[PDB]
Coordinates of C-alpha atoms in Angstrom, one line a residue:
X1 CA 9.0 4.7 35.7
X2 CA 10.3 3.8 32.1
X3 CA 8.3 6.6 30.4
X4 CA 7.9 6.4 26.6
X5 CA 6.3 9.1 24.6
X6 CA 4.6 8.3 21.3
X7 CA 4.1 11.3 19.0
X8 CA 1.6 10.5 16.3
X9 CA -0.9 12.0 13.9
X10 CA -3.9 10.5 15.8
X11 CA -6.3 13.0 14.3
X12 CA -6.1 14.4 10.8
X13 CA -5.1 12.9 7.5
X14 CA -2.8 10.2 8.9
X15 CA -5.3 9.0 11.6
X16 CA -5.5 5.4 10.4
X17 CA -1.7 5.0 10.3
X18 CA -1.2 6.6 13.6
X19 CA -3.6 4.2 15.3
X20 CA -1.7 1.2 13.7
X21 CA 1.6 2.6 15.0
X22 CA 0.2 2.7 18.5
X23 CA -1.2 -0.9 18.2
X24 CA 2.3 -2.1 17.1
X25 CA 4.1 -0.2 19.9
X26 CA 1.8 -1.8 22.6
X27 CA 2.0 -5.3 21.1
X28 CA 5.7 -5.0 20.8
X29 CA 6.1 -3.9 24.5
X30 CA 3.8 -6.7 25.5
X31 CA 5.9 -9.2 23.5
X32 CA 9.3 -7.9 24.8
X33 CA 8.1 -8.1 28.5
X34 CA 6.1 -11.4 28.2
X35 CA 3.0 -9.3 29.1
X36 CA 4.4 -7.9 32.3
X37 CA 5.0 -4.3 31.0
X38 CA 8.0 -4.2 33.3
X39 CA 11.7 -4.1 32.4
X40 CA 14.4 -4.7 35.0
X41 CA 11.9 -3.6 37.7
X42 CA 10.7 -0.5 35.9
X43 CA 7.0 -0.3 35.0
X44 CA 6.7 0.8 31.3
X45 CA 4.2 3.6 30.8
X46 CA 3.3 5.0 27.4
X47 CA 2.2 8.6 27.0
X48 CA 0.6 9.4 23.6
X49 CA 0.6 12.9 22.1
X50 CA -1.5 13.7 19.0
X51 CA 0.2 16.2 16.8
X52 CA -2.5 16.3 14.1
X53 CA 0.3 15.9 11.5
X54 CA 0.9 19.6 12.0
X55 CA 4.6 20.4 12.5
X56 CA 4.1 23.3 15.0
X57 CA 1.9 21.2 17.2
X58 CA 4.4 18.3 16.9
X59 CA 7.3 20.4 18.2
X60 CA 5.2 21.6 21.1
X61 CA 3.9 18.0 21.9
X62 CA 7.4 16.6 21.9
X63 CA 8.8 19.4 24.1
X64 CA 5.9 18.8 26.5
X65 CA 6.6 15.1 26.5
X66 CA 10.2 15.6 27.5
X67 CA 9.7 18.5 29.9
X68 CA 6.3 18.1 31.6
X69 CA 5.7 14.4 31.3
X70 CA 9.3 13.5 32.0
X71 CA 9.5 11.1 29.1
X72 CA 12.8 9.2 29.0
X73 CA 12.6 8.7 25.2
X74 CA 10.2 9.5 22.4
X75 CA 9.0 7.8 19.3
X76 CA 7.4 9.7 16.4
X77 CA 5.8 10.7 14.2
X78 CA 3.4 9.9 11.3
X79 CA 4.2 12.9 9.0
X80 CA 7.8 13.4 7.8
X81 CA 7.3 17.2 7.8
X82 CA 6.3 17.0 11.5
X83 CA 9.2 14.7 12.3
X84 CA 11.7 17.0 10.6
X85 CA 10.4 19.9 12.7
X86 CA 10.8 17.8 15.8
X87 CA 14.4 16.9 15.4
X88 CA 15.8 20.1 17.0
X89 CA 13.5 19.5 20.0
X90 CA 15.3 16.3 20.8
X91 CA 18.7 18.1 20.7
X92 CA 17.4 21.0 22.8
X93 CA 16.1 18.6 25.6
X94 CA 19.1 16.2 25.2
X95 CA 16.7 13.3 24.8
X96 CA 16.4 10.6 22.1
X97 CA 13.8 10.6 19.4
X98 CA 13.3 7.3 17.6
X99 CA 11.8 8.2 14.3
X100 CA 8.9 5.9 13.3
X101 CA 7.2 5.8 10.7
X102 CA 8.5 8.9 9.0
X103 CA 10.5 8.0 5.9
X104 CA 12.1 11.3 4.8
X105 CA 15.8 10.8 3.9
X106 CA 16.8 14.1 5.4
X107 CA 16.0 12.9 8.9
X108 CA 19.1 10.8 8.9
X109 CA 20.9 13.1 6.4
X110 CA 21.2 16.9 6.2
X111 CA 18.8 17.5 9.1
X112 CA 20.1 14.8 11.4
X113 CA 21.5 15.2 14.9
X114 CA 23.0 12.8 17.4
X115 CA 19.8 12.4 19.4
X116 CA 18.0 11.0 16.4
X117 CA 17.6 7.3 15.7
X118 CA 15.2 5.8 13.1
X119 CA 13.5 2.4 13.0
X120 CA 11.3 3.3 10.0
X121 CA 12.8 2.6 6.6
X122 CA 13.9 5.7 4.7
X123 CA 12.9 6.5 1.1
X124 CA 16.3 5.6 -0.1
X125 CA 15.8 2.1 1.3
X126 CA 12.6 1.8 -0.6
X127 CA 14.2 2.9 -3.9
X128 CA 17.3 0.9 -3.5
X129 CA 15.5 -2.3 -2.5
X130 CA 13.5 -2.0 -5.7
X131 CA 16.7 -1.7 -7.8
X132 CA 18.3 -4.7 -6.1
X133 CA 15.1 -6.7 -6.5
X134 CA 14.5 -6.1 -10.3
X135 CA 18.0 -5.3 -11.6
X136 CA 19.8 -8.2 -13.2
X137 CA 21.9 -8.9 -16.3
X138 CA 19.5 -8.9 -19.3
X139 CA 17.2 -6.3 -18.0
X140 CA 16.6 -2.7 -19.3
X141 CA 14.7 -0.2 -17.2
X142 CA 13.0 3.1 -17.9
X143 CA 11.8 5.1 -14.9
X144 CA 8.7 7.3 -14.4
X145 CA 8.6 9.8 -11.5
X146 CA 7.0 13.1 -10.5
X147 CA 9.1 16.2 -11.1
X148 CA 9.8 17.0 -7.4
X149 CA 12.4 16.1 -4.8
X150 CA 10.8 12.8 -3.7
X151 CA 10.7 11.6 -7.2
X152 CA 14.1 12.8 -8.3
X153 CA 15.9 11.7 -5.2
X154 CA 14.1 8.3 -5.3
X155 CA 15.2 7.7 -8.9
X156 CA 18.7 8.9 -8.1
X157 CA 19.0 6.3 -5.3
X158 CA 17.5 3.6 -7.5
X159 CA 19.9 4.5 -10.4
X160 CA 23.0 4.4 -8.3
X161 CA 22.0 0.9 -6.9
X162 CA 21.0 -0.3 -10.3
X163 CA 24.5 0.4 -11.7
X164 CA 26.0 -2.5 -9.7
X165 CA 23.3 -5.0 -10.7
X166 CA 24.0 -5.6 -14.4
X167 CA 20.7 -3.9 -15.5
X168 CA 20.7 -0.9 -17.9
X169 CA 18.8 2.3 -17.4
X170 CA 17.5 3.5 -20.8
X171 CA 15.7 6.7 -19.8
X172 CA 14.2 8.7 -16.9
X173 CA 11.0 10.6 -17.3
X174 CA 9.9 13.3 -14.9
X175 CA 6.4 14.7 -15.2
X176 CA 4.4 17.3 -13.3
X177 CA 3.3 16.1 -9.8
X178 CA -0.3 16.7 -10.9
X179 CA -0.2 14.6 -14.0
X180 CA -3.3 12.4 -14.6
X181 CA -3.0 11.8 -18.4
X182 CA -0.1 9.5 -19.1
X183 CA -0.7 9.0 -22.8
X184 CA 2.3 11.0 -24.0
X185 CA 4.8 10.0 -21.4
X186 CA 3.6 6.4 -21.7
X187 CA 4.4 6.4 -25.4
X188 CA 7.9 7.8 -24.8
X189 CA 8.6 5.1 -22.2
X190 CA 7.3 2.4 -24.6
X191 CA 9.3 3.8 -27.5
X192 CA 12.5 3.9 -25.3
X193 CA 12.2 0.2 -24.5
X194 CA 10.3 -1.6 -27.3
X195 CA 13.3 -2.4 -29.5
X196 CA 15.6 -3.6 -26.7
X197 CA 16.5 -7.3 -26.4
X198 CA 15.9 -9.1 -23.1
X199 CA 13.5 -8.1 -20.4
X200 CA 12.1 -4.5 -20.4
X201 CA 10.6 -2.9 -17.3
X202 CA 9.1 0.5 -16.5
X203 CA 9.7 1.2 -12.8
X204 CA 7.4 3.8 -11.3
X205 CA 7.9 5.9 -8.2
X206 CA 4.8 7.9 -7.3
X207 CA 3.2 9.5 -4.2
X208 CA -0.4 10.6 -3.9
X209 CA -3.2 10.1 -6.5
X210 CA -2.9 9.9 -10.3
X211 CA -2.8 6.1 -10.6
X212 CA 0.1 5.9 -13.2
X213 CA 0.3 2.0 -12.9
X214 CA -3.4 1.5 -13.9
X215 CA -3.2 4.1 -16.6
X216 CA 0.0 2.6 -18.1
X217 CA -1.4 -0.9 -17.8
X218 CA -4.5 0.3 -19.7
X219 CA -2.2 1.1 -22.6
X220 CA -1.1 -2.6 -22.9
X221 CA 2.7 -2.6 -22.3
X222 CA 2.8 -6.3 -22.9
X223 CA 2.2 -5.7 -26.6
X224 CA 5.8 -4.3 -26.6
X225 CA 7.1 -7.0 -24.3
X226 CA 7.3 -4.4 -21.4
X227 CA 6.5 -5.2 -17.7
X228 CA 5.5 -2.6 -15.2
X229 CA 7.1 -2.5 -11.7
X230 CA 6.7 -0.4 -8.6
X231 CA 7.3 -0.6 -4.8
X232 CA 4.9 -2.3 -2.3
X233 CA 2.4 -0.5 -0.2
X234 CA 0.0 -0.7 2.6
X235 CA -3.0 -3.1 2.3
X236 CA -5.7 -0.6 1.2
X237 CA -3.3 0.7 -1.5
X238 CA -2.7 -2.9 -2.7
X239 CA -6.3 -3.3 -3.9
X240 CA -5.2 -1.4 -7.1
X241 CA -2.4 -3.9 -7.6
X242 CA -5.0 -6.7 -8.3
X243 CA -5.0 -5.2 -11.9
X244 CA -1.2 -6.1 -12.1
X245 CA -0.9 -9.8 -11.8
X246 CA 2.8 -11.0 -11.7
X247 CA 4.1 -7.5 -11.1
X248 CA 7.4 -7.5 -9.2
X249 CA 9.0 -4.9 -6.9
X250 CA 10.2 -4.5 -3.4
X251 CA 8.4 -3.7 -0.2
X252 CA 9.1 -2.7 3.4
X253 CA 6.6 -5.3 4.7
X254 CA 3.7 -7.7 3.9
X255 CA 2.3 -9.7 6.8
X256 CA 2.6 -13.2 5.3
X257 CA 6.2 -12.8 4.1
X258 CA 8.5 -12.7 7.2
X259 CA 8.9 -16.1 8.9
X260 CA 10.2 -15.6 12.3
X261 CA 8.8 -16.1 15.8
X262 CA 8.0 -12.4 16.3
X263 CA 6.1 -11.9 13.1
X264 CA 4.3 -15.3 13.7
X265 CA 3.0 -14.1 17.1
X266 CA 2.2 -10.6 15.8
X267 CA 0.2 -11.9 12.8
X268 CA -1.7 -14.6 14.8
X269 CA -2.5 -12.3 17.7
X270 CA -3.4 -9.3 15.6
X271 CA -5.9 -11.5 13.6
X272 CA -7.4 -12.9 16.8
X273 CA -7.8 -9.4 18.4
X274 CA -8.8 -7.3 15.4
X275 CA -9.8 -9.8 12.6
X276 CA -7.3 -8.2 10.2
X277 CA -3.6 -8.6 9.6
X278 CA -0.9 -6.2 10.7
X279 CA 0.3 -3.5 8.2
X280 CA 3.4 -1.3 7.7
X281 CA 2.6 0.9 10.7
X282 CA 1.9 -2.0 13.0
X283 CA 5.2 -3.7 12.1
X284 CA 7.1 -0.4 12.6
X285 CA 5.6 0.4 15.9
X286 CA 6.5 -3.0 17.1
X287 CA 10.1 -2.5 15.8
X288 CA 10.3 0.8 17.8
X289 CA 9.1 -1.0 20.9
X290 CA 11.8 -3.6 20.5
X291 CA 14.5 -1.0 19.9
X292 CA 13.6 0.8 23.2
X293 CA 13.4 -2.3 25.3
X294 CA 16.7 -3.7 23.9
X295 CA 18.4 -0.3 24.4
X296 CA 17.3 0.2 28.0
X297 CA 18.1 -3.4 28.9
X298 CA 21.6 -3.0 27.3
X299 CA 22.3 0.4 28.9
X300 CA 20.9 -0.5 32.3
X301 CA 19.9 3.1 32.4
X302 CA 17.7 5.7 30.8
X303 CA 20.5 8.3 30.8
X304 CA 20.7 9.8 27.3
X305 CA 24.4 9.5 26.8
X306 CA 24.3 5.8 28.0
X307 CA 21.4 5.2 25.6
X308 CA 23.2 6.7 22.6
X309 CA 26.3 4.6 23.3
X310 CA 24.2 1.5 23.7
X311 CA 22.2 2.1 20.6
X312 CA 25.0 3.0 18.1
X313 CA 25.7 -0.3 16.2
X314 CA 23.0 -2.1 18.2
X315 CA 21.2 -5.1 16.8
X316 CA 17.6 -5.8 17.8
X317 CA 14.9 -8.3 16.8
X318 CA 11.7 -7.2 15.1
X319 CA 8.9 -8.7 13.0
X320 CA 11.2 -8.2 10.1
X321 CA 14.0 -10.2 11.8
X322 CA 17.2 -8.5 12.7
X323 CA 17.6 -4.7 12.4
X324 CA 20.8 -2.8 13.3
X325 CA 21.2 0.9 14.1
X326 CA 24.1 2.0 12.0
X327 CA 26.7 3.9 14.1
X328 CA 27.3 6.7 11.6
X329 CA 23.7 7.9 10.9
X330 CA 21.6 6.0 13.4
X331 CA 19.4 4.5 10.6
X332 CA 18.1 1.0 11.2
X333 CA 19.4 -1.2 8.5
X334 CA 16.8 -3.9 7.8
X335 CA 15.7 -6.5 5.3
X336 CA 13.4 -5.6 2.5
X337 CA 11.2 -8.0 0.4
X338 CA 11.3 -8.7 -3.3
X339 CA 7.7 -9.7 -4.1
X340 CA 5.5 -10.9 -7.0
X341 CA 1.8 -10.0 -7.1
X342 CA -0.7 -12.8 -7.0
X343 CA -4.4 -11.9 -7.5
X344 CA -6.8 -13.8 -5.2
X345 CA -10.3 -12.5 -6.0
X346 CA -11.5 -13.2 -2.5
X347 CA -8.8 -11.1 -0.8
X348 CA -9.2 -7.3 -0.7
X349 CA -5.5 -6.6 -1.5
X350 CA -3.2 -8.1 -4.0
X351 CA -1.2 -10.8 -2.3
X352 CA 2.5 -10.1 -2.3
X353 CA 4.2 -13.5 -2.7
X354 CA 7.9 -13.8 -1.7
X355 CA 10.6 -13.9 -4.4
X356 CA 13.6 -13.2 -2.2
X357 CA 14.3 -11.6 1.2
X358 CA 16.9 -8.9 0.5
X359 CA 19.2 -9.1 3.5
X360 CA 21.0 -6.1 5.0
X361 CA 24.3 -6.8 3.2
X362 CA 22.5 -7.0 -0.2
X363 CA 21.8 -3.2 -0.2
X364 CA 24.3 -0.3 0.1
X365 CA 22.3 2.5 1.9
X366 CA 24.2 5.8 1.4
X367 CA 25.5 7.8 4.5
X368 CA 24.4 11.4 4.0
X369 CA 24.8 13.0 7.4
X370 CA 28.4 14.3 7.0
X371 CA 28.3 18.1 7.0

């Protein structure tokens, strides 16, 4: 009777992540309902739809969920390109789509509509949290990014947040997306910082292969008194960070950082069931579960207009503590975590030790959905 559709890239390149989203969603619904899978008398049923991270298949799966399966609400999807394609389907069917995990800023910006909410963090939250984490008086930063919208828009968001922190931005380098040799750009970055007083940091934003952090580290930035910094990542990706002891940045999640009853249960039970800790996608799927149950409980209905009214400005509890759907753009505001890398040779990933929890009010996330 409460029918939730999960759209996810169960097969294809994002398979591993999609499976984690599903695990988090089911564990979150279990937690929220004390294992009953019922809410105010309604049995909760989850319908999963594999979109193969293909946008045309995603649009069709979501329509099918709303129209054939009678889903009351949907959560999706793994690929930002698929999620962006899906947004008009929510509007056409007058049903809510809770976006999770897709991060693309445009989902709550230029391409947003009133039926779209998002529990996943957006790419602006990633960049901004990094600026707030590392930006202080006595710090000078140079940035390295790929020459494409993700890189440029990420550095733009970082730069705007950094301006209020007391840190100075010395230079911005943008290199072809396919760059694998960082010798030339590395030297420009080092030359831009080496004579500055105080602390000097190269902050990197990068998607895909190329391994700029390792390649810059191989050039020995410490000889110029320069530190490297980048955002956090999923556990398999953190293996590479074992080469960067003491590196700081900000992350969406690391299992051992948040200390709250929800995360405590999630971590303990996930380890018991699967012999591994929860990751980004697990935490986000859980957050989406909690958003749905809190909304339906508050609305006392699955009517879409009642759900929108209930969800705008709505606080809900997650493994990351409190999240709130901002009324204007329906983006979940949420904590982010300033970390410092610790290298434990017995652990497969670099350990992200807590420096500070960046609370919701510590980050100004721009509102970009005004047309």
